[PDB]
Amino acid sequence: GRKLELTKAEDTQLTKRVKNAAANVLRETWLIYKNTKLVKKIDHAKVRKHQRKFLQAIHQLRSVKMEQRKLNDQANTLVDLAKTQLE
Amino acid sequence: GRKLELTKAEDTQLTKRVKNAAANVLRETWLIYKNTKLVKKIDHAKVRKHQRKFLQAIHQLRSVKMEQRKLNDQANTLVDLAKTQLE
Amino acid sequence: DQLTEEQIAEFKEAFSLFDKDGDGTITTKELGTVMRSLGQNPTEAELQDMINEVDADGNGTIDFPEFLTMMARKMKDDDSEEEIREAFRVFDKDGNGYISAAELRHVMTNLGEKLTDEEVDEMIREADIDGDGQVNYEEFVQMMTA
Amino acid sequence: DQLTEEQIAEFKEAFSLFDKDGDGTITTKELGTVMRSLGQNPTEAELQDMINEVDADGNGTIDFPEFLTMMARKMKDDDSEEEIREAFRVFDKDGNGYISAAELRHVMTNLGEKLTDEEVDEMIREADIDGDGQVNYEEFVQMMTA
Ligand SMILES: [Ca+2]
Ligand SMILES: [Ca+2]
Ligand SMILES: [Ca+2]
Ligand SMILES: [Ca+2]
């Protein structure tokens, strides 16, 4: 029997959250790189602006990943419950 | 400057969720073990009952862990924002 | 990820754990109820996402054949040794790898659903391998999962 | 995890990003507003937990000295190479390690906050190292994070 074993861990809403935030990670990574490495004189205010936007986009992608991990474990919960009937 | 670097990733409510569910993981792990390995005749209905309770407790602990990861990244978001002012 | 005849009938019993009114369909509302009976708290959007993940005909509810695709895709199981160890470690106050028999009794007779002092007798009898009144929970969990 | 004089003044500027009314205190409500301006959606309990984590005097709000303990405890930063790579990989349709210049233009001129076709010119000029009209995003991200 399955004993103490449980289901192995391997949306449109999340999908668009991901693509907007990912584009923004590309956008701000580029703009921080340009403004810290390809300019004669570094405009710190500009860098600060894009660092805010950069962290916002990185953390949005993190929030999506964590929500997908939560969703996956919720589905695993259903499957683990269904699987009790195999006993 | 910090460039593209961000804060490194290393409650009473959650605390009691953890202790109740952890105790229940101990409880059901024991009762499944006893009923599948220390009995003459395996009562499958009994095993099924404790497998339901076991998965419920394991998944509750998972939900707490994921909530703590979410909380930690929220705090890291605040710190990353505060840190833009170092630029 | 292909299934058998005995499992189909068994997963039919499973479907009834979810289809609380028996109309042969699982709604977000029914899924909420079940997930909450398992001590979880999915939001509305999370419930819809779980349905949406396996809703072929896209009619907003899970039917029995949609229920079996969820299952086929996920039959693989995994050993729970490490997670169970972490649950014991919640009660390892000094993080020394041990929980005394007295502390285990305290935990188990007061927290969660609880055991009776007598059930705890049997549990400690198995757990206290060395008879030193202390439980090396890593070793104990490995015995129960072997 | 000890801090300097310049950083204290700087973190004072930081405090004002959060203390929207300036009463020298950050409430759950003010934290919500800020976290939402960063495109996040913490629940009430999450906001209270963030305050509670660093609320010494336990009066329910974060003051500036409580704000510096959050910071001292967390000054360490980490390289973002891998996470940035994963963001590019969102647009790698075949998962082959490349995004064409044309696809990058499409993404960047239509999604998120967007760049102008001219900003994209400069970005692609840097990204298309080999001048083959294709961006090896792993290599490009490593150049920008070096
Ligand atoms: Ca129904
Ligand atoms: Ca359906
Ligand atoms: Ca205030
Ligand atoms: Ca306070």
Side-chain angles (χ1 to χ4, degrees), chain A residues 1-9 11-87, chain B residues 1-9 11-87, chain C residues 3-146, chain D residues 3-146:
Chain A
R2 298 174 61 252
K3 288 171 273 203
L4 299 165
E5 300 203 339
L6 303 164
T7 299
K8 183 179 179 66
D11 203 39
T12 41
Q13 177 72 226
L14 266 29
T15 302
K16 64 175 174 31
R17 284 185 184 182
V18 180
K19 284 191 186 77
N20 286 319
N24 283 341
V25 170
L26 274 49
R27 181 184 196 270
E28 308 302 334
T29 297
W30 167 245
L31 292 168
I32 289 170
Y33 173 76
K34 182 189 178 180
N35 279 283
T36 67
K37 294 179 183 176
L38 298 172
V39 281
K40 293 195 175 289
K41 195 173 179 185
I42 289 180
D43 173 342
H44 281 95
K46 221 162 209 168
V47 173
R48 263 195 288 110
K49 185 181 62 178
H50 299 296
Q51 279 180 333
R52 292 195 299 273
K53 287 169 170 149
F54 170 75
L55 71 88
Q56 154 190 119
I58 285 281
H59 282 290
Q60 287 172 327
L61 285 183
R62 292 177 183 175
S63 295
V64 169
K65 277 174 207 178
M66 289 185 281
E67 178 73 4
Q68 191 60 52
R69 290 176 195 118
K70 188 182 182 202
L71 282 169
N72 289 351
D73 193 62
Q74 289 172 339
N76 290 342
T77 302
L78 266 72
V79 174
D80 282 336
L81 180 63
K83 285 187 172 158
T84 64
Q85 296 315 117
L86 306 166
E87 175 69 27
Chain B
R2 298 174 61 252
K3 288 171 273 203
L4 299 165
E5 300 203 339
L6 303 164
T7 299
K8 183 179 179 66
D11 203 39
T12 41
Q13 177 72 226
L14 266 29
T15 302
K16 64 175 174 31
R17 284 185 184 182
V18 180
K19 284 191 186 77
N20 286 319
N24 283 341
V25 170
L26 274 49
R27 181 184 196 270
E28 308 302 334
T29 297
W30 167 245
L31 292 168
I32 289 170
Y33 173 76
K34 182 189 178 180
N35 279 283
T36 67
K37 294 179 183 176
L38 298 172
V39 281
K40 293 195 175 289
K41 195 173 179 185
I42 289 180
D43 173 342
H44 281 95
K46 221 162 209 168
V47 173
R48 263 195 288 110
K49 185 181 62 178
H50 299 296
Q51 279 180 333
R52 292 195 299 273
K53 287 169 170 149
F54 170 75
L55 71 88
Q56 154 190 119
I58 285 281
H59 282 290
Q60 287 172 327
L61 285 183
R62 292 177 183 175
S63 295
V64 169
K65 277 174 207 178
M66 289 185 281
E67 178 73 4
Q68 191 60 52
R69 290 176 195 118
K70 188 182 182 202
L71 282 169
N72 289 351
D73 193 62
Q74 289 172 339
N76 290 342
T77 302
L78 266 72
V79 174
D80 282 336
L81 180 63
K83 285 187 172 158
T84 64
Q85 296 315 117
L86 306 166
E87 175 69 27
Chain C
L3 306 142
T4 62
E5 180 192 349
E6 61 187 40
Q7 299 176 319
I8 45 146
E10 279 167 324
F11 279 142
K12 181 49 157 74
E13 292 170 16
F15 193 78
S16 288
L17 299 171
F18 295 94
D19 179 13
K20 306 296 285 174
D21 68 351
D23 69 338
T25 217
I26 309 167
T27 60
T28 48
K29 183 186 173 68
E30 286 175 321
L31 196 60
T33 294
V34 170
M35 286 294 286
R36 281 190 302 279
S37 76
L38 297 175
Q40 287 194 48
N41 289 271
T43 66
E44 180 60 18
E46 284 163 357
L47 294 175
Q48 299 197 14
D49 295 342
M50 187 179 299
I51 289 175
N52 291 14
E53 193 89 276
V54 287
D55 183 21
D57 56 6
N59 65 355
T61 60
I62 300 162
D63 61 27
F64 181 73
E66 292 164 344
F67 184 77
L68 293 169
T69 291
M70 178 155 191
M71 302 299 154
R73 289 178 173 177
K74 283 219 187 73
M75 289 297 293
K76 199 167 187 307
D77 296 318
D78 211 337
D79 161 84
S80 296
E81 186 195 333
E82 192 250 305
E83 274 186 287
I84 296 174
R85 188 159 74 210
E86 286 295 308
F88 275 86
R89 190 165 290 122
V90 163
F91 302 112
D92 182 355
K93 289 181 274 192
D94 35 8
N96 58 13
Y98 283 95
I99 302 157
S100 72
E103 182 52 25
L104 185 55
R105 191 170 289 280
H106 186 253
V107 166
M108 300 309 308
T109 59
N110 288 286
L111 290 171
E113 198 149 343
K114 299 175 277 182
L115 298 161
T116 182
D117 283 279
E118 297 66 59
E119 285 168 327
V120 160
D121 280 338
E122 310 176 4
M123 175 181 184
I124 284 171
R125 185 176 174 75
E126 296 310 310
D128 183 14
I129 289 159
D130 304 296
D132 67 335
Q134 300 288 339
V135 173
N136 181 326
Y137 54 86
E138 182 175 340
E139 279 198 341
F140 182 42
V141 167
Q142 285 178 338
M143 174 171 52
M144 297 188 283
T145 56
Chain D
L3 306 142
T4 62
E5 180 192 349
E6 61 187 40
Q7 299 176 319
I8 45 146
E10 279 167 324
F11 279 142
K12 181 49 157 74
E13 292 170 16
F15 193 78
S16 288
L17 299 171
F18 295 94
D19 179 13
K20 306 296 285 174
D21 68 351
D23 69 338
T25 217
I26 309 167
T27 60
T28 48
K29 183 186 173 68
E30 286 175 321
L31 196 60
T33 294
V34 170
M35 286 294 286
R36 281 190 302 279
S37 76
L38 297 175
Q40 287 194 48
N41 289 271
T43 66
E44 180 60 18
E46 284 163 357
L47 294 175
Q48 299 197 14
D49 295 342
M50 187 179 299
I51 289 175
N52 291 14
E53 193 89 276
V54 287
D55 183 21
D57 56 6
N59 65 355
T61 60
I62 300 162
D63 61 27
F64 181 73
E66 292 164 344
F67 184 77
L68 293 169
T69 291
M70 178 155 191
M71 302 299 154
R73 289 178 173 177
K74 283 219 187 73
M75 289 297 293
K76 199 167 187 307
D77 296 318
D78 211 337
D79 161 84
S80 296
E81 186 195 333
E82 192 250 305
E83 274 186 287
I84 296 174
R85 188 159 74 210
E86 286 295 308
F88 275 86
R89 190 165 290 122
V90 163
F91 302 112
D92 182 355
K93 289 181 274 192
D94 35 8
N96 58 13
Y98 283 95
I99 302 157
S100 72
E103 182 52 25
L104 185 55
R105 191 170 289 280
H106 186 253
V107 166
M108 300 309 308
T109 59
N110 288 286
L111 290 171
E113 198 149 343
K114 299 175 277 182
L115 298 161
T116 182
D117 283 279
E118 297 66 59
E119 285 168 327
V120 160
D121 280 338
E122 310 176 4
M123 175 181 184
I124 284 171
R125 185 176 174 75
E126 296 310 310
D128 183 14
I129 289 159
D130 304 296
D132 67 335
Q134 300 288 339
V135 173
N136 181 326
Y137 54 86
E138 182 175 340
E139 279 198 341
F140 182 42
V141 167
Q142 285 178 338
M143 174 171 52
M144 297 188 283
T145 56

